[PDB]
């Protein structure tokens, strides 16, 4: 029973998925610390009461509420309008 | 001094002629030298361990300024050396110093060029401003046949207000540039 | 090359990394010791 012989591929890899993205959206209450975006660039630029880590990660600097903002050529900002 | 021949000549002779030739309304529209940047290429100096800081301290006598030590931006194996430590030698002259340099060049140096029939009249081309290049650097007074060792030429770009080379041609010819008609 | 660093004349360690051939020798640098605050540190 004559078995045909076959090859191999040099292909079968991908990396671990890395769960990127926005983590809180407009109008979600947040505490200081809360990370808001996991990103690979300045896909969003940090706004009011928003810091950004060595890895581009945006985060709430206060306990507030999130607002987004497109400024066309200036890009997109995430802010935390504080409640108090 | 704050005044030299050419400088005077420009104002009390050429300035007006041009206003008469081309009919300018404003003092500023009247073309004027901007600068004369002079430069040496120097494909050697790189190699044979060549310090060749001989050229700048020498150049400084003629131009009157300590030149600046320019360097290569890519790596070219083909044409040797690798970006950086590289070589080239460039000085920028404005005001008096510019004038003193041209004064001497036109009135003296171009005279003892080896051949000579006049400066090439195809080295502006619209693109206002004028380029020319030399071979021997001893053609200037300050340089002596004792001082030399290698004959390093140079490029002279002279930049002006003139937007067309018509009106720029006039300016230079009237300042005393002998052109090869 | 892996590398440690000493509050010159005693204890403490900080630990780094030089490139020997590349700019290397006598690695010395102004770092802080918890060993009463703070001095010049050598390699080893």
């Amino acid at each position: 029973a004559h078995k045909k012989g076959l090859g191999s591929t040099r292909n079968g890899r991908d990396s671990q998925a890395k769960r990127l993205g926005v983590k809180r959206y407009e109008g979600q209450v947040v505490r200081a610390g809360n990370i808001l975006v996991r990103q690979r660039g300045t896909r969003f630029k940090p706004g009011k009461n928003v810091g950004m880590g060595r890895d581009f990660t945006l985060f709430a600097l206060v306990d507030g509420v999130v607002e987004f903002q497109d400024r066309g050529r200036l890009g997109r900002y995430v802010h935390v309008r504080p409640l108090a | 001094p704050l005044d030299v021949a050419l400088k005077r000549k420009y104002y009390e002779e050429v300035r007006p002629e041009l206003i008469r030739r081309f009919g300018y309304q404003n003092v500023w529209e009247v073309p004027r030298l901007e600068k004369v940047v002079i430069n040496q290429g120097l494909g050697e100096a790189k190699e044979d361990a060549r310090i060749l800081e001989k050229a700048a301290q020498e150049l400084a006598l003629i131009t009157g300024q300590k030149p600046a030590v320019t360097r290569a931006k890519k790596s070219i194996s083909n044409f040797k050396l690798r970006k950086g430590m590289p070589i080239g030698l460039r000085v920028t002259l404005r005001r008096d110093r510019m004038w003193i340099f041209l004064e001497k060049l036109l009135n003296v140096a171009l005279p003892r060029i080896r051949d000579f029939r006049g400066l090439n009249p195809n080295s502006f081309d619209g693109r206002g401003n004028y380029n020319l290049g030399l071979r021997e650097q001893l053609i200037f007074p300050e340089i002596t046949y004792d001082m030399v060792d290698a004959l390093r030429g140079m490029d002279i770009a002279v930049v002006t207000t003139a937007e067309t080379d018509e009106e720029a041609r006039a300016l230079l010819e009237l300042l005393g540039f002998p052109f090869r008609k | 090359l892996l590398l440690e660093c000493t509050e010159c004349k005693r204890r403490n360690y900080a630990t780094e990394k030089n490139k020997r051939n590349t700019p290397n020798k006598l690695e010395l640098r102004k770092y802080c010791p918890w060993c009463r605050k703070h001095t010049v540190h050598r390699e080893v």
Binding site: K4, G7, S8 | - | -
Partner: protein, 141 residues
């Protein structure tokens, strides 16, 4: 035979055939078209064959416009082999064709010669075809 000169990638996924043609659906060059009535992959060998027949008919005569181009690679595992072990080898190339695509076109010819030539070609194609004229295909102003 009829293939690109380069490709970004050597092999590519098969995909599907939604209706319509997207474009290439109106005349534009010559004075008579051969239009698609069904989707299909058309192989370079078919295109060529048809084209040659066209010419052969009005031998060396008018002009021909081949409006589909086989950019898609066509894989096929070696014969007799079992499954797995990566994608197959590239055997040829196809042009994706969808109903209402004007695949051919002719100029400088009698309607009699044309009508006929095309018919002939329609035979070499593995799909149903229709002949066309130059109606309201003049997308102007």
């Amino acid at each position: 035979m009829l293939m690109p000169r380069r490709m970004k990638y050597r092999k590519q996924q098969r995909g599907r055939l939604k209706g319509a043609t997207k474009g290439g659906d109106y005349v534009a060059f010559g004075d008579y078209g051969l239009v698609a009535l069904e989707p299909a992959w058309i192989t370079a060998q078919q295109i060529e064959a048809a084209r040659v027949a066209m010419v052969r008919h009005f031998r060396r005569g008018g002009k021909i416009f081949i409006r589909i181009f086989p950019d898609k690679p066509y894989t096929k595992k070696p014969l007799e082999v079992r499954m797995g072990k990566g994608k197959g080898n590239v055997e040829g190339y196809v042009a994706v064709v969808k109903p209402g695509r004007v695949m051919f076109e002719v100029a400088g010819v009698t309607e009699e010669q044309a009508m006929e030539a095309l018919r002939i070609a329609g035979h070499k194609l593995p799909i149903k075809t229709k002949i066309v004229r130059r109606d309201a295909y003049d997308e102007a102003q």
